[PDB]
PDB file of all heavy atoms in Angstrom:
ATOM      1  N   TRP A   1     151.134  89.828  67.123  1.00 25.81           N
ATOM      2  CA  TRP A   1     151.270  90.916  68.069  1.00 25.81           C
ATOM      3  C   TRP A   1     150.013  91.739  68.257  1.00 25.81           C
ATOM      4  O   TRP A   1     149.711  92.130  69.391  1.00 25.81           O
ATOM      5  CB  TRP A   1     152.420  91.846  67.647  1.00 25.81           C
ATOM      6  CG  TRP A   1     152.514  93.116  68.427  1.00 25.81           C
ATOM      7  CD1 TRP A   1     152.012  94.305  68.066  1.00 25.81           C
ATOM      8  CD2 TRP A   1     153.213  93.304  69.660  1.00 25.81           C
ATOM      9  NE1 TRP A   1     152.303  95.250  69.046  1.00 25.81           N
ATOM     10  CE2 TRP A   1     153.034  94.641  70.015  1.00 25.81           C
ATOM     11  CE3 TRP A   1     153.918  92.470  70.512  1.00 25.81           C
ATOM     12  CZ2 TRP A   1     153.564  95.207  71.191  1.00 25.81           C
ATOM     13  CZ3 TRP A   1     154.476  93.019  71.654  1.00 25.81           C
ATOM     14  CH2 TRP A   1     154.280  94.371  71.991  1.00 25.81           C
ATOM     15  N   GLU A   2     149.247  92.036  67.187  1.00 24.00           N
ATOM     16  CA  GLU A   2     148.110  92.920  67.342  1.00 24.00           C
ATOM     17  C   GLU A   2     146.943  92.231  67.985  1.00 24.00           C
ATOM     18  O   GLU A   2     146.495  92.616  69.074  1.00 24.00           O
ATOM     19  CB  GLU A   2     147.674  93.484  65.983  1.00 24.00           C
ATOM     20  CG  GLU A   2     148.755  93.740  64.933  1.00 24.00           C
ATOM     21  CD  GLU A   2     149.468  95.044  65.117  1.00 24.00           C
ATOM     22  OE1 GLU A   2     149.530  95.595  66.224  1.00 24.00           O
ATOM     23  OE2 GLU A   2     149.928  95.565  64.062  1.00 24.00           O
ATOM     24  N   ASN A   3     146.472  91.125  67.412  1.00 26.15           N
ATOM     25  CA  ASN A   3     145.293  90.403  67.927  1.00 26.15           C
ATOM     26  C   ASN A   3     145.674  89.427  69.042  1.00 26.15           C
ATOM     27  O   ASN A   3     145.319  88.268  69.006  1.00 26.15           O
ATOM     28  CB  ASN A   3     144.565  89.718  66.779  1.00 26.15           C
ATOM     29  CG  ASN A   3     144.302  90.623  65.621  1.00 26.15           C
ATOM     30  OD1 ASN A   3     144.685  90.335  64.491  1.00 26.15           O
ATOM     31  ND2 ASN A   3     143.667  91.754  65.923  1.00 26.15           N
ATOM     32  N   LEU A   4     146.397  89.958  70.068  1.00 26.85           N
ATOM     33  CA  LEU A   4     146.898  89.090  71.112  1.00 26.85           C
ATOM     34  C   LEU A   4     147.054  89.927  72.396  1.00 26.85           C
ATOM     35  O   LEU A   4     147.420  91.101  72.349  1.00 26.85           O
ATOM     36  CB  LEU A   4     148.229  88.450  70.729  1.00 26.85           C
ATOM     37  CG  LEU A   4     148.112  87.081  70.085  1.00 26.85           C
ATOM     38  CD1 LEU A   4     149.481  86.490  69.850  1.00 26.85           C
ATOM     39  CD2 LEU A   4     147.259  86.179  70.933  1.00 26.85           C
ATOM     40  N   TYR A   5     146.785  89.298  73.521  1.00 26.11           N
ATOM     41  CA  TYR A   5     147.188  89.771  74.826  1.00 26.11           C
ATOM     42  C   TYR A   5     148.707  89.896  74.823  1.00 26.11           C
ATOM     43  O   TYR A   5     149.437  89.113  74.185  1.00 26.11           O
ATOM     44  CB  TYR A   5     146.740  88.799  75.879  1.00 26.11           C
ATOM     45  CG  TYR A   5     147.021  89.202  77.313  1.00 26.11           C
ATOM     46  CD1 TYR A   5     146.702  90.431  77.754  1.00 26.11           C
ATOM     47  CD2 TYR A   5     147.545  88.255  78.225  1.00 26.11           C
ATOM     48  CE1 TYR A   5     146.897  90.767  79.064  1.00 26.11           C
ATOM     49  CE2 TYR A   5     147.737  88.600  79.519  1.00 26.11           C
ATOM     50  CZ  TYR A   5     147.426  89.874  79.920  1.00 26.11           C
ATOM     51  OH  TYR A   5     147.670  90.256  81.253  1.00 26.11           O
ATOM     52  N   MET A   6     149.195  90.936  75.495  1.00 26.40           N
ATOM     53  CA  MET A   6     150.596  91.373  75.316  1.00 26.40           C
ATOM     54  C   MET A   6     151.575  90.327  75.818  1.00 26.40           C
ATOM     55  O   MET A   6     152.591  90.094  75.132  1.00 26.40           O
ATOM     56  CB  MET A   6     150.843  92.694  76.025  1.00 26.40           C
ATOM     57  CG  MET A   6     152.070  93.395  75.487  1.00 26.40           C
ATOM     58  SD  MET A   6     152.191  95.110  76.036  1.00 26.40           S
ATOM     59  CE  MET A   6     150.676  95.666  75.373  1.00 26.40           C
ATOM     60  N   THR A   7     151.328  89.717  76.974  1.00 25.96           N
ATOM     61  CA  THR A   7     152.224  88.691  77.433  1.00 25.96           C
ATOM     62  C   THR A   7     152.054  87.412  76.645  1.00 25.96           C
ATOM     63  O   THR A   7     153.022  86.684  76.394  1.00 25.96           O
ATOM     64  CB  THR A   7     152.064  88.448  78.927  1.00 25.96           C
ATOM     65  OG1 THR A   7     150.726  87.962  79.198  1.00 25.96           O
ATOM     66  CG2 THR A   7     152.275  89.703  79.708  1.00 25.96           C
ATOM     67  N   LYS A   8     150.825  87.145  76.168  1.00 24.29           N
ATOM     68  CA  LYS A   8     150.605  86.059  75.216  1.00 24.29           C
ATOM     69  C   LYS A   8     151.376  86.319  73.905  1.00 24.29           C
ATOM     70  O   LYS A   8     151.991  85.387  73.356  1.00 24.29           O
ATOM     71  CB  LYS A   8     149.123  85.860  74.950  1.00 24.29           C
ATOM     72  CG  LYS A   8     148.345  85.456  76.201  1.00 24.29           C
ATOM     73  CD  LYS A   8     146.901  85.180  75.849  1.00 24.29           C
ATOM     74  CE  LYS A   8     146.065  85.072  77.098  1.00 24.29           C
ATOM     75  NZ  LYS A   8     144.566  84.906  76.834  1.00 24.29           N
ATOM     76  N   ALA A   9     151.329  87.553  73.439  1.00 22.68           N
ATOM     77  CA  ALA A   9     152.063  87.916  72.253  1.00 22.68           C
ATOM     78  C   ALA A   9     153.571  87.728  72.433  1.00 22.68           C
ATOM     79  O   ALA A   9     154.266  87.165  71.570  1.00 22.68           O
ATOM     80  CB  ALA A   9     151.750  89.369  71.853  1.00 22.68           C
ATOM     81  N   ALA A  10     154.091  88.183  73.588  1.00 21.97           N
ATOM     82  CA  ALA A  10     155.502  88.018  73.879  1.00 21.97           C
ATOM     83  C   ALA A  10     155.913  86.554  73.998  1.00 21.97           C
ATOM     84  O   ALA A  10     156.946  86.141  73.476  1.00 21.97           O
ATOM     85  CB  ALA A  10     155.840  88.748  75.188  1.00 21.97           C
ATOM     86  N   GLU A  11     155.048  85.735  74.622  1.00 23.82           N
ATOM     87  CA  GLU A  11     155.356  84.308  74.739  1.00 23.82           C
ATOM     88  C   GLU A  11     155.329  83.596  73.375  1.00 23.82           C
ATOM     89  O   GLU A  11     156.231  82.800  73.115  1.00 23.82           O
ATOM     90  CB  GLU A  11     154.330  83.648  75.691  1.00 23.82           C
ATOM     91  CG  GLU A  11     154.280  82.164  75.635  1.00 23.82           C
ATOM     92  CD  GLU A  11     155.492  81.426  76.252  1.00 23.82           C
ATOM     93  OE1 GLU A  11     156.323  82.105  76.859  1.00 23.82           O
ATOM     94  OE2 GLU A  11     155.583  80.202  76.079  1.00 23.82           O
ATOM     95  N   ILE A  12     154.384  83.931  72.513  1.00 21.67           N
ATOM     96  CA  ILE A  12     154.357  83.250  71.228  1.00 21.67           C
ATOM     97  C   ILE A  12     155.460  83.719  70.312  1.00 21.67           C
ATOM     98  O   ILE A  12     156.015  82.955  69.521  1.00 21.67           O
ATOM     99  CB  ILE A  12     152.973  83.374  70.565  1.00 21.67           C
ATOM    100  CG1 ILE A  12     152.829  82.390  69.378  1.00 21.67           C
ATOM    101  CG2 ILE A  12     152.650  84.767  70.086  1.00 21.67           C
ATOM    102  CD1 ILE A  12     152.942  80.933  69.730  1.00 21.67           C
ATOM    103  N   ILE A  13     155.852  84.985  70.436  1.00 23.45           N
ATOM    104  CA  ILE A  13     157.011  85.476  69.620  1.00 23.45           C
ATOM    105  C   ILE A  13     158.269  84.801  70.181  1.00 23.45           C
ATOM    106  O   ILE A  13     159.199  84.441  69.400  1.00 23.45           O
ATOM    107  CB  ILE A  13     157.097  87.032  69.648  1.00 23.45           C
ATOM    108  CG1 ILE A  13     155.935  87.600  68.878  1.00 23.45           C
ATOM    109  CG2 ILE A  13     158.359  87.502  68.985  1.00 23.45           C
ATOM    110  CD1 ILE A  13     155.731  89.078  69.070  1.00 23.45           C
ATOM    111  N   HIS A  14     158.357  84.595  71.492  1.00 20.80           N
ATOM    112  CA  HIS A  14     159.515  83.864  72.064  1.00 20.80           C
ATOM    113  C   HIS A  14     159.537  82.419  71.604  1.00 20.80           C
ATOM    114  O   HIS A  14     160.630  81.895  71.332  1.00 20.80           O
ATOM    115  CB  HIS A  14     159.421  83.920  73.579  1.00 20.80           C
ATOM    116  CG  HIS A  14     160.619  83.290  74.266  1.00 20.80           C
ATOM    117  ND1 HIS A  14     160.656  81.971  74.582  1.00 20.80           N
ATOM    118  CD2 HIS A  14     161.832  83.799  74.617  1.00 20.80           C
ATOM    119  CE1 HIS A  14     161.809  81.677  75.139  1.00 20.80           C
ATOM    120  NE2 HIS A  14     162.510  82.756  75.167  1.00 20.80           N
ATOM    121  N   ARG A  15     158.351  81.783  71.454  1.00 17.57           N
ATOM    122  CA  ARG A  15     158.352  80.423  70.971  1.00 17.57           C
ATOM    123  C   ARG A  15     158.712  80.336  69.500  1.00 17.57           C
ATOM    124  O   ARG A  15     159.344  79.333  69.091  1.00 17.57           O
ATOM    125  CB  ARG A  15     156.976  79.805  71.241  1.00 17.57           C
ATOM    126  CG  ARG A  15     156.665  79.612  72.698  1.00 17.57           C
ATOM    127  CD  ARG A  15     155.497  78.671  72.928  1.00 17.57           C
ATOM    128  NE  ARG A  15     155.233  78.486  74.382  1.00 17.57           N
ATOM    129  CZ  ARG A  15     154.467  77.523  74.826  1.00 17.57           C
ATOM    130  NH1 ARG A  15     153.850  76.663  74.060  1.00 17.57           N
ATOM    131  NH2 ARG A  15     154.275  77.467  76.171  1.00 17.57           N
ATOM    132  N   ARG A  16     158.333  81.322  68.713  1.00 12.37           N
ATOM    133  CA  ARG A  16     158.659  81.285  67.307  1.00 12.37           C
ATOM    134  C   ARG A  16     160.108  81.672  67.013  1.00 12.37           C
ATOM    135  O   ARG A  16     160.729  81.180  66.081  1.00 12.37           O
ATOM    136  CB  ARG A  16     157.717  82.146  66.474  1.00 12.37           C
ATOM    137  CG  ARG A  16     156.276  81.670  66.501  1.00 12.37           C
ATOM    138  CD  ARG A  16     155.740  81.471  65.100  1.00 12.37           C
ATOM    139  NE  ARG A  16     156.264  80.246  64.487  1.00 12.37           N
ATOM    140  CZ  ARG A  16     155.874  79.012  64.782  1.00 12.37           C
ATOM    141  NH1 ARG A  16     154.912  78.768  65.646  1.00 12.37           N
ATOM    142  NH2 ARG A  16     156.466  77.984  64.152  1.00 12.37           N
ATOM    143  N   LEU A  17     160.674  82.610  67.816  1.00 10.79           N
ATOM    144  CA  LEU A  17     162.047  83.115  67.576  1.00 10.79           C
ATOM    145  C   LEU A  17     163.113  82.391  68.349  1.00 10.79           C
ATOM    146  O   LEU A  17     164.293  82.472  67.986  1.00 10.79           O
ATOM    147  CB  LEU A  17     162.104  84.627  67.873  1.00 10.79           C
ATOM    148  CG  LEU A  17     161.227  85.528  67.052  1.00 10.79           C
ATOM    149  CD1 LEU A  17     161.609  87.004  67.306  1.00 10.79           C
ATOM    150  CD2 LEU A  17     161.347  85.237  65.552  1.00 10.79           C
ATOM    151  N   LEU A  18     162.712  81.657  69.406  1.00 12.92           N
ATOM    152  CA  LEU A  18     163.674  80.893  70.205  1.00 12.92           C
ATOM    153  C   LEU A  18     163.434  79.386  70.150  1.00 12.92           C
ATOM    154  O   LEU A  18     164.370  78.641  70.544  1.00 12.92           O
ATOM    155  CB  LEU A  18     163.623  81.339  71.672  1.00 12.92           C
ATOM    156  CG  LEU A  18     164.561  82.443  72.160  1.00 12.92           C
ATOM    157  CD1 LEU A  18     165.993  81.970  72.035  1.00 12.92           C
ATOM    158  CD2 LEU A  18     164.338  83.753  71.464  1.00 12.92           C
ATOM    159  N   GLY A  19     162.298  78.943  69.730  1.00 16.73           N
ATOM    160  CA  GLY A  19     162.016  77.529  69.646  1.00 16.73           C
ATOM    161  C   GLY A  19     161.776  76.846  71.018  1.00 16.73           C
ATOM    162  O   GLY A  19     161.924  75.636  71.107  1.00 16.73           O
ATOM    163  N   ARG A  20     161.406  77.629  72.036  1.00 17.66           N
ATOM    164  CA  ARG A  20     161.166  77.057  73.344  1.00 17.66           C
ATOM    165  C   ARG A  20     160.274  77.992  74.160  1.00 17.66           C
ATOM    166  O   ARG A  20     160.381  79.212  73.945  1.00 17.66           O
ATOM    167  CB  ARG A  20     162.488  76.828  74.064  1.00 17.66           C
ATOM    168  CG  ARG A  20     163.429  77.988  74.133  1.00 17.66           C
ATOM    169  CD  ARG A  20     164.511  77.758  75.160  1.00 17.66           C
ATOM    170  NE  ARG A  20     165.119  78.972  75.631  1.00 17.66           N
ATOM    171  CZ  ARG A  20     164.648  79.717  76.644  1.00 17.66           C
ATOM    172  NH1 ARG A  20     163.575  79.367  77.315  1.00 17.66           N
ATOM    173  NH2 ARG A  20     165.302  80.806  76.984  1.00 17.66           N
ATOM    174  N   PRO A  21     159.432  77.476  75.019  1.00 18.52           N
ATOM    175  CA  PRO A  21     158.715  78.340  75.925  1.00 18.52           C
ATOM    176  C   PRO A  21     159.661  79.037  76.931  1.00 18.52           C
ATOM    177  O   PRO A  21     160.785  78.588  77.143  1.00 18.52           O
ATOM    178  CB  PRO A  21     157.742  77.431  76.646  1.00 18.52           C
ATOM    179  CG  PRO A  21     157.646  76.195  75.810  1.00 18.52           C
ATOM    180  CD  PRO A  21     158.983  76.090  75.115  1.00 18.52           C
ATOM    181  N   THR A  22     159.165  80.098  77.529  1.00 16.44           N
ATOM    182  CA  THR A  22     159.929  80.778  78.561  1.00 16.44           C
ATOM    183  C   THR A  22     159.982  79.926  79.824  1.00 16.44           C
ATOM    184  O   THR A  22     159.152  78.984  80.006  1.00 16.44           O
ATOM    185  CB  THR A  22     159.322  82.118  78.904  1.00 16.44           C
ATOM    186  OG1 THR A  22     157.877  81.967  79.047  1.00 16.44           O
ATOM    187  CG2 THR A  22     159.536  83.079  77.799  1.00 16.44           C
ATOM    188  N   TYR A  23     160.949  80.207  80.683  1.00 18.54           N
ATOM    189  CA  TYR A  23     161.140  79.381  81.890  1.00 18.54           C
ATOM    190  C   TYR A  23     160.371  79.934  83.111  1.00 18.54           C
ATOM    191  O   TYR A  23     159.716  79.154  83.794  1.00 18.54           O
ATOM    192  CB  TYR A  23     162.631  79.294  82.215  1.00 18.54           C
ATOM    193  CG  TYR A  23     163.386  78.319  81.337  1.00 18.54           C
ATOM    194  CD1 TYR A  23     164.507  78.717  80.586  1.00 18.54           C
ATOM    195  CD2 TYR A  23     163.003  76.996  81.215  1.00 18.54           C
ATOM    196  CE1 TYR A  23     165.189  77.843  79.761  1.00 18.54           C
ATOM    197  CE2 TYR A  23     163.681  76.101  80.397  1.00 18.54           C
ATOM    198  CZ  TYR A  23     164.767  76.529  79.671  1.00 18.54           C
ATOM    199  OH  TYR A  23     165.465  75.693  78.872  1.00 18.54           O
ATOM    200  N   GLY A  24     160.493  81.204  83.354  1.00 19.56           N
ATOM    201  CA  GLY A  24     159.860  81.760  84.515  1.00 19.56           C
ATOM    202  C   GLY A  24     159.692  83.251  84.432  1.00 19.56           C
ATOM    203  O   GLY A  24     159.862  83.851  83.376  1.00 19.56           O
ATOM    204  N   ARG A  25     159.344  83.858  85.582  1.00 15.95           N
ATOM    205  CA  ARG A  25     159.031  85.297  85.655  1.00 15.95           C
ATOM    206  C   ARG A  25     160.188  86.192  85.348  1.00 15.95           C
ATOM    207  O   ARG A  25     159.983  87.334  85.077  1.00 15.95           O
ATOM    208  CB  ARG A  25     158.436  85.612  87.020  1.00 15.95           C
ATOM    209  CG  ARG A  25     157.021  85.085  87.201  1.00 15.95           C
ATOM    210  CD  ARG A  25     156.513  85.418  88.579  1.00 15.95           C
ATOM    211  NE  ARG A  25     156.333  86.872  88.735  1.00 15.95           N
ATOM    212  CZ  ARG A  25     156.422  87.505  89.900  1.00 15.95           C
ATOM    213  NH1 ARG A  25     156.680  86.824  91.011  1.00 15.95           N
ATOM    214  NH2 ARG A  25     156.259  88.816  89.942  1.00 15.95           N
ATOM    215  N   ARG A  26     161.427  85.642  85.438  1.00 18.32           N
ATOM    216  CA  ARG A  26     162.573  86.404  84.957  1.00 18.32           C
ATOM    217  C   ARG A  26     162.446  86.780  83.525  1.00 18.32           C
ATOM    218  O   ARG A  26     162.375  87.968  83.141  1.00 18.32           O
ATOM    219  CB  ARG A  26     163.853  85.585  85.186  1.00 18.32           C
ATOM    220  CG  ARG A  26     164.752  86.022  86.343  1.00 18.32           C
ATOM    221  CD  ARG A  26     163.969  86.295  87.599  1.00 18.32           C
ATOM    222  NE  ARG A  26     164.756  86.000  88.795  1.00 18.32           N
ATOM    223  CZ  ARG A  26     164.668  86.728  89.896  1.00 18.32           C
ATOM    224  NH1 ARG A  26     163.887  87.778  90.003  1.00 18.32           N
ATOM    225  NH2 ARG A  26     165.441  86.386  90.952  1.00 18.32           N
ATOM    226  N   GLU A  27     162.374  85.743  82.676  1.00 18.80           N
ATOM    227  CA  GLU A  27     162.284  85.933  81.251  1.00 18.80           C
ATOM    228  C   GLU A  27     161.007  86.684  80.868  1.00 18.80           C
ATOM    229  O   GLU A  27     161.054  87.774  80.251  1.00 18.80           O
ATOM    230  CB  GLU A  27     162.375  84.559  80.585  1.00 18.80           C
ATOM    231  CG  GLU A  27     163.777  84.178  80.114  1.00 18.80           C
ATOM    232  CD  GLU A  27     163.735  82.841  79.381  1.00 18.80           C
ATOM    233  OE1 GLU A  27     163.173  81.924  79.864  1.00 18.80           O
ATOM    234  OE2 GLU A  27     164.370  82.770  78.222  1.00 18.80           O
ATOM    235  N   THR A  28     159.840  86.165  81.316  1.00 12.30           N
ATOM    236  CA  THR A  28     158.571  86.774  80.917  1.00 12.30           C
ATOM    237  C   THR A  28     158.412  88.216  81.401  1.00 12.30           C
ATOM    238  O   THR A  28     157.880  89.038  80.698  1.00 12.30           O
ATOM    239  CB  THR A  28     157.405  85.902  81.464  1.00 12.30           C
ATOM    240  OG1 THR A  28     157.312  86.068  82.898  1.00 12.30           O
ATOM    241  CG2 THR A  28     157.612  84.475  81.122  1.00 12.30           C
ATOM    242  N   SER A  29     158.876  88.483  82.635  1.00 12.92           N
ATOM    243  CA  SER A  29     158.885  89.836  83.148  1.00 12.92           C
ATOM    244  C   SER A  29     159.742  90.757  82.298  1.00 12.92           C
ATOM    245  O   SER A  29     159.320  91.898  81.980  1.00 12.92           O
ATOM    246  CB  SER A  29     159.366  89.863  84.589  1.00 12.92           C
ATOM    247  OG  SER A  29     160.736  89.603  84.671  1.00 12.92           O
TER     248      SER A  29
END
């Protein structure tokens, strides 16, 4: 979270906690 761009941080936390990339601007937004 700290040493990361915020949407990059959100995407990588989503990949670690959900096991899958986000689908689109709904989720990422």
Side-chain angles (χ1 to χ4, degrees):
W1 170 266
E2 326 275 29
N3 310 124
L4 268 185
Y5 184 46
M6 199 167 302
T7 63
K8 297 185 193 174
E11 163 73 8
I12 193 60
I13 292 167
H14 184 271
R15 292 197 180 193
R16 295 236 75 76
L17 296 191
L18 267 299
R20 53 166 201 87
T22 46
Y23 282 124
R25 286 179 67 208
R26 254 47 149 143
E27 265 183 309
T28 71
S29 71

